[PDB]
Subunit: 89 residues, 2 copies
């Protein structure tokens, strides 16, 4: 009966948490992405980030997408903001 | 960093748990559905269920949709199987 539902909820939570950890870990274990995070947190422009990291618009866009999927940044208007999850040391 | 991620993950888990509870609770709080579950659990056919409960296939299929959405039955090949959650 109702207590057994907790098995379904457990399985789902384990699956989701696995996915979330994978996405976060993928985002943060890349030194270029770590520098993007530090620069965004200092309010650096996308142009300066591209110049300093030698990234094309496409390459930066890719890294931003990964950071967003890994819960490290969120957009407010036209600016990417580093989240609590994205703030490392 | 990681502690903030964990706080979010916990909150997400509780949210999706509440969603699962909503779906299950809806499924089991209908006496026609409760009888459908008891009958499936005893190996009754959909045809027997339709006859015994005076349901059209359309009505039975809708109940089965609701039970599936609420984790009370799962499909195995051609058969709807009652899960431990659906054994009341």
């Amino acid at each position: 009966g109702h207590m057994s539902l907790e098995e379904w909820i457990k399985a789902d939570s384990l699956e989701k948490a696995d996915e979330y950890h994978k996405r976060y870990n993928y985002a943060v274990t890349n030194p270029v992405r770590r520098k993007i995070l530090r620069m965004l947190d200092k309010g650096r422009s996308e142009e300066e980030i591209m110049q300093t990291l030698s990234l094309s618009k496409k390459q930066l866009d890719y890294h931003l997408k990964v950071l967003e999927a890994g819960f490290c940044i969120e957009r407010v208007g036209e600016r990417w903001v580093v989240t609590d999850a994205g703030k490392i040391v």
